[PDB]
């Protein structure tokens, strides 16, 4: 896999209880590095990785501004999308927005993407050309037209191709000690007897970064340790693939 | 870094 800079934006309308909830989280690869929560008193972008704690106020001012602007545009979008679907004011609804750029082995732009989802279901998607949008619904068609007429894609393309890449480079550098350092799984198998008749084998992987991994031989979803690393196991030899070890350990 | 201008739906 390739280096990336992604953000995951969530807006939730709160009928009766005032302005919608809004949260943005920034990830380089599988490391989270920033957060904005609008439920704070004076809501600001904050660092959420030790290598971001040395950034000046110029940076946090700007990201705080972007996030606040986003939160306000998302508030309007929720109200607008309500009208499109002829839903009442009484019910809570969700707008989500993921966007990210990826580098190739050459450290150049490789691909960008953006997607909006309304109440868990895809709504509007940026196309690979980074020049046009694709609706799913009829509702999303008014959005496509509106976005198209607005040249919304011109803005997102410059972000994805130039900004998102220039800043991904700055983040990989500021936190090289942690982001470029690989950590392969520590593997072992454990014996769990169900009776004298049947037994259960469990292939463990622990303390690995990044979270991409395959356990081959009941497959449990990859999960975080809370120290930056990840954990996984499979159950019924066991083959373990991860970009941190030269060949699959069996 | 965030994009300034979240798209308008």
């Amino acid at each position, epitope marked *: 896999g390739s280096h990336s800079l992604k953000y995951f934006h969530t807006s939730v309308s709160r009928p009766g209880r005032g302005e919608p909830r809004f949260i943005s989280v920034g990830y380089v690869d599988d490391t989270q590095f920033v957060r904005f929560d609008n439920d704070a008193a004076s809501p600001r972008m904050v660092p959420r990785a030790p290598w971001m704690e040395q950034e000046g106020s110029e940076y946090w001012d700007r990201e705080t*501004r972007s996030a*606040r602007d986003t939160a*306000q545009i998302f508030r*309007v979008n929720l109200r607008t999308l309500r009208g499109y679907y002829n839903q009442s004011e009484a019910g809570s609804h969700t707008l989500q927005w993921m966007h990210g750029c990826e580098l190739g082995p050459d450290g150049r732009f490789l691909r960008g993407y953006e997607q909006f989802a309304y109440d868990g279901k895809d709504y509007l998607t940026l196309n690979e050309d980074l020049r046009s949008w694709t609706a799913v619904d009829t509702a999303a068609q008014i959005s496509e037209q509106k976005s198209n007429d607005a040249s919304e894609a011109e*803005h997102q393309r410059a972000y994805l191709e*130039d900004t998102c890449v220039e800043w991904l480079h700055k983040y990989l550098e500021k936190g090289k000690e942690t982001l470029l350092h690989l950590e392969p799984p520590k593997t072992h198998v454990t014996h769990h007897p169900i009776s004298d008749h049947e037994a259960t084998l469990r292939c463990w992987a622990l303390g690995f970064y990044p979270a991409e991994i395959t356990l081959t031989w009941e497959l449990v979803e990859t999960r975080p340790a809370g120290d930056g690393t990840f954990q996984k196991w499979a159950a019924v030899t066991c083959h373990v693939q991860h970009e941190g070890l030269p060949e699959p350990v069996t | 870094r965030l994009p*300034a201008k*979240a798209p308008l739906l």
Partner: T-cell receptor
Amino acid sequence: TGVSQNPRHKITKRGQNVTFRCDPISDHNRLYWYRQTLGQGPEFLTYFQSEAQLEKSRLLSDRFSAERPKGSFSTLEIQRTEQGDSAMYLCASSLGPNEQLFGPGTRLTVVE
Amino acid sequence: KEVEQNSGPLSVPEGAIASLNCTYSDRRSRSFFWYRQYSGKSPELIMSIYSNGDKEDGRFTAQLNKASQYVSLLIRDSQPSDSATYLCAVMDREYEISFGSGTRLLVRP
């Protein structure tokens, strides 16, 4: 909803104080204050992101000040008003860094 | 100045195409705006352009050239009702707007 500004015209005696108000478009979070004189373009004074005043002109006079207490309406106050303060005081709102739409302005004449 | 406009009076006979032209310094400027401002009135937004090429609205055309860093306004069938100062406004890579000094158009009836 357009951008409201009152008064539209204001006569004040040199040395007096004046206070203009602007109401932006409902869903617009940014509010900008500009001044304009004959055959020049709008000159930046200050802007607000909701309640937060994020910037002011490097050259802004100590006599000029603005507030947006409730993050809604904004007031611009000129103290000890001078002849040279005579100009068009434009307010503009925007939804993030989208288009800036202007109010009908407050024209201040400062008379002897 | 970040944004340049010939301020001098532009005189044009009724029915000619008026060519308003504006030049901006920041090669990565993000959005580009034409405001109409009648004497004693506030600026009215008439064209918004972002992408290389042309936007059309009535007798108005906006032309954006990011390579030459030119932005133009064309007024087809120019009427004296179009006599006004036309303000060029550009938002830089950071999305910070600048208003040029404007160009005074005078459509001779």
